[PDB]
Amino acid sequence: SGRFSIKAKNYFLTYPKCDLTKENALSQITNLQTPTNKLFIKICRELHENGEPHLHILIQFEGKYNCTNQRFFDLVSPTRSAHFHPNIQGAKSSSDVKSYIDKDGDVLEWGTFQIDGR
Structure with missing residues (x-):
């Protein structure tokens, strides 16, 4: 009696124990089309304490993107x-994104982020 539908301006992709590189994910993600438009793209790598390589991604579209399908972010x-199914998460409102975006270091940066408001 319910369907998986995500609606947000920003999205966070998490790849557990994913040996996927930011370049591949960057190219794939960057090559990944959307019903809206891709603005900024932040890719940061993080290692889990479980010894598993984790990958973090933060993208923000110009308009509220509907990610009601975990097949679009399907990275291989x-x-x-081997195919990998990342966890799609809709980032509500908050500058916390900018904070994390500013937290650069051994990460890849694409596009230009812009905070809505005054």
Whole structure:
């Protein structure tokens, strides 16, 4: 009696124990089309204490993007015949995104972020 439908301006992709690189995810994500428009793209890598390689991503579209399908963010290994299903999360409102975006260091940056308001 319910369907998985995500609606937000910003989205966060999390790849658990994913050996996927930011470049591949960046190219794939960047190449990933949307019903809206991609503005800024922040890709930061993080290692889990479980010894598993984790990957964090933060994208923000010009308009509220509807991610009611976990097939769009379906990233696969261009080096291995393995597919990875990242966790799609809708980031509500908050500058916390800017804070994290500013938290650069050994990360990839694409597009230009813009805070709505005055």
